[PDB]
Design an enzyme around this catalytic site. Structure first.
Site, mmCIF file in Angstrom:
data_model
loop_
_atom_site.group_PDB
_atom_site.id
_atom_site.type_symbol
_atom_site.label_atom_id
_atom_site.label_comp_id
_atom_site.label_asym_id
_atom_site.label_seq_id
_atom_site.Cartn_x
_atom_site.Cartn_y
_atom_site.Cartn_z
ATOM 1 N N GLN A 1 0.860 -1.230 0.000
ATOM 2 C CA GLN A 1 0.000 0.000 0.000
ATOM 3 C C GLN A 1 0.883 1.264 0.000
ATOM 4 O O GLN A 1 1.835 1.333 0.769
ATOM 5 C CB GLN A 1 -0.885 -0.098 1.244
ATOM 6 C CG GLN A 1 -1.712 1.177 1.465
ATOM 7 C CD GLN A 1 -2.654 0.942 2.650
ATOM 8 O OE1 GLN A 1 -2.562 -0.062 3.336
ATOM 9 N NE2 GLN A 1 -3.563 1.817 2.931
ATOM 10 N N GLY A 2 0.633 2.256 -0.812
ATOM 11 C CA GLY A 2 1.519 3.479 -0.784
ATOM 12 C C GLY A 2 2.423 3.424 -2.006
ATOM 13 O O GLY A 2 2.854 4.441 -2.511
ATOM 14 N N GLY B 1 0.210 2.735 -7.892
ATOM 15 C CA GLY B 1 0.374 3.791 -8.924
ATOM 16 C C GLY B 1 1.792 3.924 -9.426
ATOM 17 O O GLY B 1 1.985 4.474 -10.496
HETATM 18 C C1 LIG Z 1 -7.752 3.731 -2.658
HETATM 19 C C2 LIG Z 1 -6.377 4.349 -2.658
HETATM 20 C C3 LIG Z 1 -6.545 5.804 -2.052
HETATM 21 C C4 LIG Z 1 -5.190 6.464 -1.832
HETATM 22 C C5 LIG Z 1 -4.281 5.498 -1.013
HETATM 23 C C6 LIG Z 1 -4.068 4.155 -1.777
HETATM 24 C C7 LIG Z 1 -5.440 3.464 -1.791
HETATM 25 O O1 LIG Z 1 -5.259 2.159 -2.381
HETATM 26 C C8 LIG Z 1 -4.784 1.031 -1.703
HETATM 27 C C9 LIG Z 1 -5.274 0.778 -0.421
HETATM 28 C C10 LIG Z 1 -4.861 -0.319 0.302
HETATM 29 C C11 LIG Z 1 -3.931 -1.208 -0.243
HETATM 30 C C12 LIG Z 1 -3.407 -1.004 -1.526
HETATM 31 C C13 LIG Z 1 -2.467 -1.921 -2.057
HETATM 32 N N1 LIG Z 1 -2.001 -2.971 -1.398
HETATM 33 C C14 LIG Z 1 -1.237 -3.510 -2.333
HETATM 34 C C15 LIG Z 1 -0.462 -4.668 -2.205
HETATM 35 C C16 LIG Z 1 0.299 -5.104 -3.297
HETATM 36 C C17 LIG Z 1 1.087 -6.260 -3.188
HETATM 37 N N2 LIG Z 1 0.782 -7.216 -2.336
HETATM 38 N N3 LIG Z 1 2.149 -6.354 -3.961
HETATM 39 C C18 LIG Z 1 0.263 -4.356 -4.499
HETATM 40 F F1 LIG Z 1 0.968 -4.763 -5.607
HETATM 41 C C19 LIG Z 1 -0.512 -3.204 -4.591
HETATM 42 C C20 LIG Z 1 -1.248 -2.823 -3.488
HETATM 43 N N4 LIG Z 1 -2.033 -1.828 -3.278
HETATM 44 C C21 LIG Z 1 -3.837 0.131 -2.262
HETATM 45 O O2 LIG Z 1 -3.322 0.333 -3.536
#
Ligand SMILES: C[C@H]1CCCC[C@@H]1Oc1cccc(-c2nc3cc(C(N)=[NH2+])c(F)cc3[nH]2)c1[O-]
Ligand SMILES: [Ca+2]
Ligand SMILES: [Cl-]
Length: 223
Positions: free
Chosen positions: A174-175, A178
């Site tokens: 997360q973070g 994008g």
């Molecule tokens: C809805 C948006 C609003 C602004 C903050 C990020 C949020 O989106 C997210 C919220 C919670 C988790 C994720 C996230 N976890 C992730 C975990 C992984 C991984 N296991 N390699 C990944 F590739 C992308 C991810 N993206 C994520 O992309």
């Protein structure tokens, strides 16, 4: 990035931080006025921060530019995250130099086994939240489609690919959402989703940018 290393200041010159009073997603600079990120990072009031290393200290090289418009892919599905890509147009063009540079779009898709660089200021713990001040890097290979579909049955579309380590321990999180997955100097993926971070047999899933090059070019050409 969990299990990654400090990139070193400005060694990933196309990496950007999307900011709304705090860092929420990463992105990639593809020319002096456009950034590519994930559709699920969309929000209004985005300030794109280029030339960053420590996101909590102005160290020099930073360029803070407001987004003029964000274009989420028209077929983006927030439930499956299929077509998870967004283009951001900057209010003014960035000054490119050795610390701020654009990355190239691919001309062909990458094969399984290609080694890529994933970077970002996302969480560094698989169990808990620790966000870093400086940019973290991870080198990870693209997995085969069969291993990816075996890990996420029924959830991988042709616009996604898995990259990572099935043993767990090293992954994007997360973070990092994008941000860029660069392989042989071309932007091949966008950090999109995954189950937890660095868990065994649950690799990260990335948006397959090679399937969107004509869309990115036609959209930039008409905006
Ligand atoms: C809805 C948006 C609003 C602004 C903050 C990020 C949020 O989106 C997210 C919220 C919670 C988790 C994720 C996230 N976890 C992730 C975990 C992984 C991984 N296991 N390699 C990944 F590739 C992308 C991810 N993206 C994520 O992309
Ligand atoms: Ca800084
Ligand atoms: Cl399947």
């Amino acid at each position: 990035i969990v299990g990654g290393y400090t990139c070193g200041a400005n060694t990933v010159p196309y990496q950007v931080s999307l900011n709304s009073g705090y860092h929420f997603c990463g992105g990639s600079l593809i020319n002096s006025q456009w950034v590519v990120s994930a559709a699920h990072c969309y929000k209004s009031g985005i300030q794109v921060r280029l030339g960053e290393d420590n996101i909590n200290v102005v160290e020099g090289n930073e360029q803070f530019i407001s987004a003029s418009k964000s274009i989420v892919h028209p077929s983006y599905n927030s439930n499956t995250l299929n077509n998870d890509i967004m283009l951001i147009k900057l209010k003014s063009a960035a000054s490119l130099n050795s610390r701020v540079a654009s990355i190239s779009l691919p001309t062909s898709c990458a094969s399984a086994g290609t080694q890529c660089l994933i970077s970002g200021w996302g969480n560094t713990k698989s169990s808990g939240t620790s966000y870093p001040d400086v940019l973290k890097c991870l080198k990870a290979p693209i997995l085969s489609d069969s291993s990816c579909k075996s890990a996420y049955p029924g959830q991988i579309t042709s616009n996604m690919f898995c990259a990572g380590y099935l043993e767990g321990g090293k992954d994007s999180c997360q973070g990092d959402s994008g941000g860029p997955v660069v392989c042989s100097g071309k932007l091949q993926g966008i950090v999109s989703w995954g189950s937890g971070c660095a868990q065994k047999n649950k690799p990260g899933v990335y948006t397959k940018v090679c399937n969107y090059v004509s869309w990115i070019k036609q959209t930039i050409a008409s905006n």
